[PDB]
């Protein structure tokens, strides 16, 4: 299990446009077009990612283009962020995962709010930074995404994936 058979299960694979639980345009592996009501403005979005006219369809290959800019771009962003990277060094691999998880479908900004949660990690308080990582809006948004990730950091193991 690595983090990119992690995400293509939480995620999925379309090839067409499709809206996010948010109601968001998203295609691919969880790949947010934008945030615009307007579907003329989401397939404009995507034909400027891909380099072509695509009138709302990729090709697998494509979304899995897109997918691996979105890991590495998630990753980086972890490095960047002064809240994010200690928390990540101080990490195993798998936990390592999870905060990538996060980071892809929440945003850097959006993880590092989470200030009680990651110091709560970064001191290895498993159950109980498991304990708060449910109270949130993300939680109660998308709970059995949310439990996979929060029994990952809780359990150190891939088991919520298995
Ligand atoms: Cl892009
Ligand atoms: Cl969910």
């Known amino acids: 299990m690595n983090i990119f058979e992690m995400l293509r299960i939480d995620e999925g694979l379309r090839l067409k446009i499709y809206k996010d639980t948010e109601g968001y345009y998203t295609i691919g592996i969880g790949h947010l077009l934008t945030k615009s009501p307007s579907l003329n403005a989401a397939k404009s979005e ?29 990753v980086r ?4 962020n002064a809240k994010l990277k200690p928390v990540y060094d101080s990490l195993n691999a798998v936990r390592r995962a999870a905060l990538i998880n996060m980071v892809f479908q929440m945003g850097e900004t959006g993880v590092a709010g989470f200030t009680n949660s990651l110091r709560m990690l970064q001191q290895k308080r498993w159950d109980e930074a498991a304990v708060n990582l449910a109270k949130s809006r993300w939680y109660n948004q998308t709970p059995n995404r949310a439990k996979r990730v929060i029994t990952t950091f809780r359990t150190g193991t891939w088991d919520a994936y298995k």
């Open 46 to 74: 995507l034909d400027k990612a891909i380099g072509r006219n695509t009138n709302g369809v990729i090709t697998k290959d494509e979304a899995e283009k897109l997918f691996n800019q979105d890991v590495d771009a998630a």
């Open 77 to 80: 962003g972890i490095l960047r």
